[PDB]
Design a protein around this ligand. Structure first.
Ligand SMILES: *[C@@H]1O[C@H](CO)[C@@H](O[C@@H]2O[C@H](CO)[C@@H](O)[C@H](O)[C@H]2NC(C)=O)[C@H](O)[C@H]1NC(C)=O
Ligand SMILES: *[C@@H]1O[C@H](CO)[C@@H](O[C@@H]2O[C@H](CO)[C@@H](O)[C@H](O)[C@H]2NC(C)=O)[C@H](O)[C@H]1NC(C)=O
Ligand SMILES: *[C@@H]1O[C@H](CO)[C@@H](O[C@@H]2O[C@H](CO)[C@@H](O)[C@H](O)[C@H]2NC(C)=O)[C@H](O)[C@H]1NC(C)=O
Ligand SMILES: *[C@@H]1O[C@H](CO)[C@@H](O[C@@H]2O[C@H](CO)[C@@H](O)[C@H](O)[C@H]2NC(C)=O)[C@H](O)[C@H]1NC(C)=O
Ligand SMILES: *[C@@H]1O[C@H](CO)[C@@H](O[C@@H]2O[C@H](CO)[C@@H](O)[C@H](O)[C@H]2NC(C)=O)[C@H](O)[C@H]1NC(C)=O
Ligand SMILES: *[C@@H]1O[C@H](CO)[C@@H](O[C@@H]2O[C@H](CO)[C@@H](O)[C@H](O)[C@H]2NC(C)=O)[C@H](O)[C@H]1NC(C)=O
Ligand SMILES: *[C@@H]1O[C@H](CO)[C@@H](O)[C@H](O)[C@H]1NC(C)=O
Ligand SMILES: *[C@@H]1O[C@H](CO)[C@@H](O)[C@H](O)[C@H]1NC(C)=O
Ligand SMILES: *[C@@H]1O[C@H](CO)[C@@H](O)[C@H](O)[C@H]1NC(C)=O
Ligand SMILES: *[C@@H]1O[C@H](CO)[C@@H](O)[C@H](O)[C@H]1NC(C)=O
Ligand SMILES: *[C@@H]1O[C@H](CO)[C@@H](O)[C@H](O)[C@H]1NC(C)=O
Ligand SMILES: *[C@@H]1O[C@H](CO)[C@@H](O)[C@H](O)[C@H]1NC(C)=O
Ligand SMILES: *[C@@H]1O[C@H](CO)[C@@H](O)[C@H](O)[C@H]1NC(C)=O
Ligand SMILES: *[C@@H]1O[C@H](CO)[C@@H](O)[C@H](O)[C@H]1NC(C)=O
Ligand SMILES: *[C@@H]1O[C@H](CO)[C@@H](O)[C@H](O)[C@H]1NC(C)=O
Ligand SMILES: *[C@@H]1O[C@H](CO)[C@@H](O)[C@H](O)[C@H]1NC(C)=O
Ligand SMILES: *[C@@H]1O[C@H](CO)[C@@H](O)[C@H](O)[C@H]1NC(C)=O
Lengths: 99, 680, 198, 49, 49
């Protein structure tokens, strides 16, 4: 099964990180929005909330970039697979070691 | 003077829908040609609006019944009027509408508006009478007939009238007038507009932008209001009391503002020309989630804009024991700084309001916890740590502060997460001749660790010569006395300091705040405030197993999802008040208005439970159940009908199923063009 | 202006995120006040011998105040769980009380006069400016302009932009003031960046 | 704060541009192969052209 | 010296032991910028005024 499994794992792993990274403080007093909202008034809790927002937004951007790169790799693999399907199944290939 | 109201034919008032009117500029910031997205207080689209006829027309065989109710002023009011001959004059706002509480009055007795913030003693049913009739002592009369007296007035403002008047053309109900009143930050903001309508009633489904009119800095508590009528019939109430209710025709519509998210659009002139209520229907939510008034054909994964929490609950442990702040702060004597007494405060309610007519706190510096949010924050461990110091040294009780007291006596830590209270006590422990009892350490071979106490009473090796236990040349006694003569300046008077060290943990609450408790909602979307812990979500009974000392349990990544109620000791479960799996399928705004809804991986039995249809607008409840209850393998697809055909895919939906907007109006006898959901 | 007289110890309670007697029952400064709080001792002006006893203050209230609210109530506080109508019973106190400014108390009790100015910067004609004077008007060079409370570097130029009567400046596509109106001539200017990167 | 935010936005734009440039480079390589294999000659590959 | 003409003095060749100035005065203000008050006992300087 090899690589066919691997990509799936990768995707799942990424998602798991995107959850397990919600516990990062990012410089705030506590990586819990409810705790900050209950402990500090708006004018002083605002800076901590912006810290958390910036950290989580950077995390989302990193996940999106990783997804884009993985999608590019999968696009290349799919193009290769489509070429193989249209050249070795719908005909015969004279290319050495192609199939 | 005033006259009472013997109305008997009162009936439950009718209701109407505020289609799209009630949109005002929710700021003072100029914006030109931009699509902004605010979530201030707005009147929801197609919201319920109460219709009042006020007077009852005496033309229809004679009716003399007056109906002028008192209405709540919950966080903003939208007022609409369709009368023509100035039947509605002004308004009264206030809390009790009596002489015991200040109130606001707006009157248009002539071609200029008058606003007063006096303390009027309003009568039961205020009104306004005499308008204009010559040779009757009624031409240009500025009578009131509204308040008996007015004393201790603060703000008065006379200016240009709100809108045009006169022009009496009966039977038309011209000049539809719209106002929005919002009392925020002390400022009372009135936004106004008027349009030349001609319909008899049932306000047209049109969009109106309300330009700002006035921002009065009155600063009063407003919770109820009433409408001022012009009951003339050529003078006041003729004859005896009552018998003067004839005023022609009256009708006004009242709506209440709620916190909603909008998509207001500005033109080149800075005037709002269109808006979208991001709660009304899936089409509006689709427009909001991508910030555009035009949506093209396809499927869209929207954000969460449907449900908003409307109720708040508080659950604190049932203790009801006032804290001994009087027994600590009003002590006969405090311990000296070098030996500070540590006391465990427990089983309190920590009501700081008690310590107001006893002392004036010169310093109330709180670390880690904001002073404002101290009345609603249950604690688990509190310590007193009281001592008396010199005035100039009161600034040395700080985490990152150095000095004599902060290096040899106390040394507050760097994560104190408590509150330092300090007040002058030159009149309590500064007896004449010098107290000379409050000692302090002056010499030490090193600094102090945080929260350390050193009752040493040794001999300081100040010089390079051992001296055993006698005061030699360079051997001083480490401790020394202050001396509180009741004549020194404020820089030497005794200051009493108490530093409380809170401790918020996953332990049962011990020292709570003065905030009381409320009921327990168990299936709706609420803002809960359990032990020092607030959050929005939906509560539900659960079978989770909790340790005896445990108070709450979190999610995979530090998200408290199962709290324990402190009043019943039963375990609750918090689920997010948001189900994001909703995909809206649209044939394009410039092709139709019907949309299909695809809730992700849910069968058509939990969808009202999943999206909380009971807390949603009726338009959303239309898209919750019905006849189109097609079920797919990626959640079911309420909104579109399923056909047995196998047409080519047009709009991908999920695993196999597609959808398309087809002109079945020719095929079907009655049903027109519609969205269908076939298989690819 | 919002001027009032308080006790010296309580002058620290005039703050956005502060709590206390005045900060909950008397004034309750907001959280976006964006102004300036001035306070000075006046023990030599309104602290006559024998006690002034004229500056009143609220001590009891059934709740807190909303920001920028005023409460001239003069009611009877329901401090106890027993109705008392309008008489000072056992647990029914008069809410207001007097300070008493004897000209002998410590600085913690001397009267302090406080004025809290709340500015408002908007796209409206200027009303309260500063002592800074005006200069000439460069119209084709690269200058650091300072129009009404608004500074910036660029090149000014006459323009045919249409401005609303109350409008003072107009911005670019993304929040960049590019057309200001001269306050001394009421003519419309246009700001172009003093940088051509090509 | 503003500088950090705008720098992050510029970095995001540059990364998106790099990814799009990689995709366009792949498309251009495919186009060049097609141009040199189906115009400058005849291709026996099935469904290639 | 009066505030309008303040005297400037070059402190040099010290060990800067603030513990000496304890039984002489009570500093009503000891506010430091750029350098923490706590980390002043272990920070050699190069120029003091
Ligand atoms: C509307 O009523 C108000 C009082 O409710 C009138 O107020 C004053 O009326 C006297 C005589 O009528 C004038 O001399 C005053 O100038 C009015 N204003 C004040 C602040 O005293 C008012 O005249 C009435 N008519 C209007 C406003 O047109
Ligand atoms: C309005 O409040 C004032 C006091 O704030 C009351 O008027 C008089 O005010 C002086 C001081 O300015 C006091 O010495 C008098 O005792 C007050 N008279 C009283 C209390 O009768 C006035 O009574 C208040 N008005 C109402 C309707 O309560
Ligand atoms: C705790 O006690 C130890 C032992 O008495 C102290 O360490 C001594 O500190 C003095 C002065 O700094 C030195 O002259 C000794 O040589 C140290 N002896 C040892 C064995 O360490 C330590 O300073 C004390 N800590 C506190 C915070 O008072
Ligand atoms: C504190 O309040 C709780 C309710 O929140 C009280 O619990 C009640 O206990 C009695 C006796 O078992 C029941 O009859 C009531 O039905 C319970 N509460 C309700 C209203 O359901 C509790 O007794 C109170 N006392 C303390 C301090 O624990
Ligand atoms: C504004 O007035 C309302 C109504 O008088 C106040 O609400 C009352 O508050 C008290 C104490 O918090 C409660 O005992 C009453 O039950 C409340 N009544 C109603 C109808 O809500 C409100 O607290 C006032 N707000 C301010 C800032 O003074
Ligand atoms: C503001 O004051 C300036 C003062 O200089 C006015 O400018 C003068 O205007 C008069 C009349 O147009 C001219 O004759 C002078 O030569 C101008 N002096 C200069 C160099 O500015 C200006 O008109 C005033 N503007 C307003 C709106 O009052
Ligand atoms: C508005 O609320 C009333 C109940 O107060 C209800 O009878 C009415 O049906 C609601 N709106 C409409 C017109 O459906
Ligand atoms: C109406 O009559 C009641 C008597 O129950 C009285 O209290 C009230 O003041 C009267 N209303 C007016 C406006 O006089
Ligand atoms: C609003 O009310 C009008 C009648 O005035 C009615 O025709 C229209 O269907 C209503 N719309 C909704 C959905 O409330
Ligand atoms: C803006 O206002 C001007 C002035 O009346 C008017 O001519 C123009 O049509 C308005 N533009 C829009 C888009 O309403
Ligand atoms: C404090 O204690 C004294 C003891 O005599 C008592 O008289 C007073 O009423 C108490 N309350 C105060 C002033 O804190
Ligand atoms: C405060 O307490 C003193 C002494 O009991 C009393 O005279 C005064 O009126 C009280 N003030 C208030 C309003 O609490
Ligand atoms: C909708 O489409 C028609 C036909 O192309 C066009 O004439 C009309 O201007 C369009 N309107 C919108 C809302 O784009
Ligand atoms: C829930 O959806 C699944 C999906 O097919 C279905 O099999 C099941 O019967 C549904 N639940 C109920 C109670 O019908
Ligand atoms: C297809 O036909 C069957 C047989 O009548 C029916 O049970 C089913 O509902 C149909 N499905 C459609 C019309 O989507
Ligand atoms: C502190 O200085 C005073 C002033 O002369 C002196 O009386 C006292 O003995 C000194 N204390 C110590 C411990 O040296
Ligand atoms: C200052 O110096 C004089 C004489 O040198 C001495 O008498 C006095 O005690 C000193 N004061 C302080 C505070 O060191």
């Amino acid at each position: 099964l090899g690589k066919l499994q691997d990509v799936v794992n990768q995707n799942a792993q990424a998602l798991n990180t995107l959850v397990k990274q919600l516990s990062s403080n990012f410089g705030a007093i506590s990586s819990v929005l409810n705790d900050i909202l209950s402990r500090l008034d708006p004018p002083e809790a605002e800076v901590q909330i912006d810290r958390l927002i910036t950290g989580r937004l950077q995390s989302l951007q990193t996940y999106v970039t990783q997804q884009l790169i993985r999608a590019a790799e999968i696009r290349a693999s799919a193009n290769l697979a489509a070429t193989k399907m249209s050249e070795c199944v719908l005909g015969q290939s004279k290319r050495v070691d192609f199939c | 003077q005033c006259v009472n109201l013997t109305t008997r034919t009162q009936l439950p008032p009718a209701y109407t829908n505020s289609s799209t009117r009630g949109v005002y500029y929710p700021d003072k910031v100029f914006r030109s040609s931009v699509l902004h997205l605010t979530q201030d207080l707005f009147l929801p689209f197609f919201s319920n609006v109460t219709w009042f006829h006020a007077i009852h027309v005496s033309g229809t065989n004679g009716i003399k019944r007056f109906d002028n109710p008192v209405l709540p002023f919950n966080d903003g009011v939208y007022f609409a009027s369709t009368e023509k001959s100035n039947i509605i004059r002004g308004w009264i706002f206030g809390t009790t509408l009596d002489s015991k509480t200040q109130s606001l009055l707006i009157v248009n007795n002539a071609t200029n508006v008058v606003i007063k913030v006096c303390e009027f003693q309003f009568c039961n049913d205020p009104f306004l009478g005499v308008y204009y009739h010559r040779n009757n002592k009624s031409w240009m009369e500025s009578e009131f007939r509204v308040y008996s007296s007015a004393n201790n007035c603060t703000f008065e403002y006379v200016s240009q009238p709100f809108l045009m008047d006169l022009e009496g053309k009966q039977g038309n109900f011209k000049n539809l007038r719209e106002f929005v009143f919002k009392n925020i930050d002390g400022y009372f903001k009135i936004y106004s507009k008027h349009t030349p309508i001609n319909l008899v009633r049932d306000l047209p489904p049109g969009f109106s932008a309300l330009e700002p009119l006035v921002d009065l800095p009155i600063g009063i508590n407003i919770t109820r209001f009433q409408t001022l009528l012009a009951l003339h019939r050529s003078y006041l109430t003729p004859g005896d009391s009552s018998s003067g209710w004839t005023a022609g025709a009256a009708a006004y519509y009242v709506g209440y503002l709620q916190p909603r998210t909008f998509l207001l659009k500005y033109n080149e002139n800075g005037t709002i020309t269109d808006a979208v209520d991001c709660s009304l229907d899936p089409l509006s939510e689709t427009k909001c989630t991508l910030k555009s008034f035009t949506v093209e054909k396809g499927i869209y994964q929207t954000s969460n804009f449907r449900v908003q929490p409307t109720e708040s609950i508080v659950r604190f442990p049932n203790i009801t024991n006032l804290c001994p702040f009087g027994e600590v702060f009003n002590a006969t004597t405090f311990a000296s700084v070098y030996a500070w007494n540590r006391k465990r405060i427990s089983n309190c309610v920590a009501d700081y309001s008690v310590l107001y007519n006893s002392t004036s706190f010169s310093t109330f510096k709180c670390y880690g916890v904001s002073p404002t949010k101290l009345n609603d924050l249950c604690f688990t461990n509190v310590y007193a740590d009281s001592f008396v110091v010199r005035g100039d040294e009161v600034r040395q009780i700080a985490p990152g502060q150095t000095g004599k007291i902060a290096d040899y006596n106390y040394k507050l830590p760097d994560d104190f997460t408590g509150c330092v209270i300090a007040w002058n006590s030159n009149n309590l422990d500064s007896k004449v001749g010098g107290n000379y009892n409050y000692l302090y350490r002056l010499f030490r071979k090193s600094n102090l660790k945080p929260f350390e106490r050193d009752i040493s009473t040794e001999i300081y090796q100040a010089g390079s010569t051992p001296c055993n236990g006698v005061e030699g040349f360079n051997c001083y006694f480490p401790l020394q006395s202050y001396g509180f003569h009741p004549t020194n300046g404020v820089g030497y008077q005794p200051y009493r300091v108490v530093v409380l060290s809170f401790e918020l943990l996953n332990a049962p609450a011990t020292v709570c705040g003065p905030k009381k408790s409320t009921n327990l909602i168990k299936n709706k979307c609420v803002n809960f405030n359990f032990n020092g812990l607030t959050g929005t979500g939906v509560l539900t009974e659960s079978n989770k197993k909790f340790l005896p000392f445990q108070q709450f349990g979190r999610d995979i990544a530090d998200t408290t999802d199962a709290v324990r109620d402190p009043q019943t000791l039963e375990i609750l479960d918090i689920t997010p008040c948001s189900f994001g799996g909703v995909s809206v399928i649209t044939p394009g705004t410039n092709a139709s208005n019907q949309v299909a809804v695809l809730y992700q991986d849910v069968n058509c039995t939990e969808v009202p439970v999943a999206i909380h249809a009971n807390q949603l607008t009726p338009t959303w409840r239309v898209y919750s159940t019905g006849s189109n209850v097609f079920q797919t393998r990626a959640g079911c697809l309420i909104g579109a009908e399923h056909v047995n055909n196998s047409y080519e895919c047009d709009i991908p939906i999920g695993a196999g199923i597609c959808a398309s907007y087809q002109t079945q109006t020719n095929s079907r006898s009655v049903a027109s063009q519609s969205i269908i959901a076939y298989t690819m």
